[PDB]
Design a protein around this nucleic acid. Structure first.
Ligand SMILES: [Zn+2]
Lengths: 97, 137, 76, 142, 38, 57
RNA sequence: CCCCGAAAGCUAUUUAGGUAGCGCCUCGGACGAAUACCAUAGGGGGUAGAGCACUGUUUCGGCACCGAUGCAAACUCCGAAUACCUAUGAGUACUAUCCGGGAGACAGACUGCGGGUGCUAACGUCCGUAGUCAAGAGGAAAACAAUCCAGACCGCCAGCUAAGGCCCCAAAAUCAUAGUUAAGUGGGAAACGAUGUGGGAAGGCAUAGACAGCUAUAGUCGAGUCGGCCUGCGCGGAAGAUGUAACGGG
């Protein structure tokens, strides 16, 4: 409840190198949700929201709610990719919990 | 004057410096660090000068980790010699720098003093740099 | 002056016939310095580790055995 | 020969008068050069002078934008060694306003005998009076 | 007047100003702090 | 079943296989239009020289 | 007068600006689908990248090993895209191959990409690969073999376009809509320096009154104020010899 991330679905036409670069130029961040008893789900997040969430340490230990459309996934942040030079977040891995 | 104790070969090809620094771009020893944002070459004299400046500023109150080591030899022709007649003699040693490469980390000093020391050190380097701090991930 | 400047003539090693091709008995399949490939069914081995066909058929490459060796064979 | 050339004996040179007060120098000079060359007539011929006569009044009131009044330089060279002379727009417009228009229109006219003949049809005067009332020029707003 | 490429404040009585497109530093306390970028 | 291919740029300085693809489609000059069968084999040649042809389906 | 049309490479040479065989050109004869492009299907690899499992090399800890951390043309536990070989197939194309007559050529150049050498110098030098020139005119780039567009059988006072352009020299918009710049930036240049001006995100304090100034924290004063981050376009750093001369000119 403390951390809520608003996301849109990332369809197959929004996957790959070119689509991801277009998204990051549009100031979005691709992310993947995986974990027990279900199939992986690809979503896109807001860079502003992600940076705001990462500024706080309790984000890395609490359970956060990712909402895409009506469905809601309760996940924990699992991995994060950053740009080597600019330190900007580039991709995120979330684990169902 | 950092330099390998032994090398398998004396002279190496020029090569091409391309790509980003995916390895060695995270803070792993200290709490605060300085990392390059532009590619280039770092010589042993430059490394020593930056280390001396940082150590003098921080008055040896903490630990300095140097994460760059110059292991690539660079040759030069004697002077007033024509082209050909073999490769030149080894003159100095460099480390290849890619954007994202962390150069120095500092442990056990206040952040303001560390930033002052890093600002003093950056003026001795041939490329642009930035300051980073340890994060969870 | 330099103390370097020598090299040997090329030896033209390598795979001569690839998988799926048809061969006639005696056709050389692989030229190799060591046994990078080993001889399977209907394939013979020369004194310099050359692999050659001993029957007419179709070349096939595979990996088999407890050591993970690369084999070439001829299917009739 | 179904495309005909204009004949010089049948060319009619009409007279016009133009006020330079508040005009931008280059944007007035382009129109002056166009009408001096005759590009505005359907009988235009590249080797024939078909243009009109243009009288310019209030020549010292012409304007430039930016800092060009102080920065735009006018050079000339006497052919003696080191004989490069230099002035600027502010001094030249106060002293010899006709030279400014002469340079501006000369630079936009063709560089040959026909161009020299073309530029003779421009009369530039500093004040608000001109001596060509006998030619009855019409007011042209450009 | 020091004419240099890098002009900075030296003390609290120094002021950075722009005159006719030139960056200058003027000090109310010490005249030796006067600087012009150039 | 069939599509129309028009050549829009010169082929004089293109790669050898690209010129051969144009010739195998049957195009001969700038502005030439041909009508060919819609098969994967023909579409391969079309897609290889996509940058100097225009296709009408 | 008509048709086709190279090469400046490999190998050897008392050979290196010569020559010979092969590669590349042309002509005659034989033979036709055996050829190529592309699509499917089969196949081997050790490069780009990456990694530390071997060989070397590197930093910091712990007790030669152990844990964190880098590097490699002559390192590899891994490993593409392309390229290369083979088979089948549609469409398109005078394609492949064999036998003979005649040659020329064996000084190359620039540009892009992958490299060695050099100083990540040279219109430098040596390879691989592709284009152009050589042996190729026309239009663009002020003028400019090798860049861009494009391949000139002859004639026309007809039309559409490519690169590139549309104020005048000089053909075509002083066209339309929305913003930015004030430096003639545009129309040469770095580390670095700075309340230049747009845009964006976040933070601190504030009408129980914030900042500056003023009166010896109290006090008049009556709205915003303060300091950083990302980003667009600008400023300084910026000295040479015949004459403005670093938009072709206006
Ligand atoms: Zn001062």
């Amino acid at each position: 409840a403390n951390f809520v991330l608003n996301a849109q679905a990332r369809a197959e036409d929004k996957q790959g190198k070119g689509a991801s670069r277009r998204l990051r130029r549009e100031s979005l961040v691709p992310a993947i949700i995986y974990g027990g008893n279900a199939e992986p789900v690809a979503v896109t997040l807001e860079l502003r929201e992600l940076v705001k969430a990462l500024e706080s340490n309790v984000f890395f230990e609490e359970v956060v709610e990712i909402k895409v459309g009506d469905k809601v996934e309760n996940v924990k942040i699992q991995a994060l990719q950053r740009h080597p030079a600019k330190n900007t977040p580039m991709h995120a891995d979330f684990k169902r919990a | 004057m950092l330099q390998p104790k032994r090398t398998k070969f004396r002279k190496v090809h020029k090569g091409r410096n391309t790509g980003l620094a995916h390895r060695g771009s995270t803070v792993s020893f200290g709490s605060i660090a300085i990392k390059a944002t532009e590619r280039g070459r770092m010589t042993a004299r430059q490394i020593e000068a930056a280390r001396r400046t940082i150590s003098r500023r921080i008055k040896r109150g903490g630990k300095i980790f140097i994460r760059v080591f110059p292991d690539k030899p660079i040759t030069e022709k004697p002077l007033e010699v024509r082209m050909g007649n073999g490769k030149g003699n080894v003159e100095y040693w460099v480390c290849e720098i890619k954007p994202g490469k962390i150069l120095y980390e500092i442990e056990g000093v206040n952040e303001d003093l560390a930033r002052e020391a890093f600002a003093l050190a950056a003026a001795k380097l041939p490329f642009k740099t930035t300051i980073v701090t340890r994060t969870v991930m | 002056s330099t103390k370097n400047g020598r090299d040997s003539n090329p030896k033209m090693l390598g795979v001569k016939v690839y998988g799926g091709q048809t061969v006639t008995a005696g056709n050389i399949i692989v030229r190799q310095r060591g046994t990078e490939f080993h001889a399977g069914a209907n394939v013979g081995m020369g004194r310099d580790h050359t692999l050659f066909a001993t029957a007419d058929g179709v070349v096939k490459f595979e990996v088999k055995g407890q050591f993970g060796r690369r084999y070439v064979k001829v299917e009739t | 020969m179904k495309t005909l050339s204009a004949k010089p004996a049948e060319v009619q040179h009409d007279w016009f008068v133009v006020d330079a007060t508040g005009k931008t120098l280059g944007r007035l000079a382009t129109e002056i050069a166009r009408r001096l060359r005759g590009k505005h007539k359907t009988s235009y011929t590249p080797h024939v002078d078909t243009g009109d006569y243009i009288i310019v009044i209030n020549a010292e009131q012409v304007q430039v934008t930016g800092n060009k009044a102080l920065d735009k330089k006018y050079y000339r060279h006497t052919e003696f060694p080191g004989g490069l002379k230099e002035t600027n727009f502010e001094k030249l417009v106060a002293h010899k306003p006709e030279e400014i228009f002469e340079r501006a229109v000369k630079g936009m006219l063709p560089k040959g005998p026909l161009g020299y003949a073309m530029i003779k049809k421009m009369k530039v005067y500093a004040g608000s009076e001109h001596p060509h009332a006998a030619q009855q020029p019409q007011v042209l707003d450009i | 007047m020091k004419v240099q490429a890098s002009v900075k404040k030296i003390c609290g009585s120094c002021k950075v100003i722009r005159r006719n497109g030139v960056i200058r530093v003027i000090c109310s306390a010490e005249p030796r702090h006067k600087q012009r970028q150039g | 079943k069939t599509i129309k291919v028009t050549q829009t740029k010169s082929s004089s300085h293109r790669l050898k296989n690209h010129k051969l693809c144009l010739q195998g489609l049957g195009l001969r000059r700038i502005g030439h239009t041909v009508e060919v069968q819609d098969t994967p084999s023909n579409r391969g040649m079309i897609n290889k020289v996509y940058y100097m042809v225009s296709v009408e389906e």
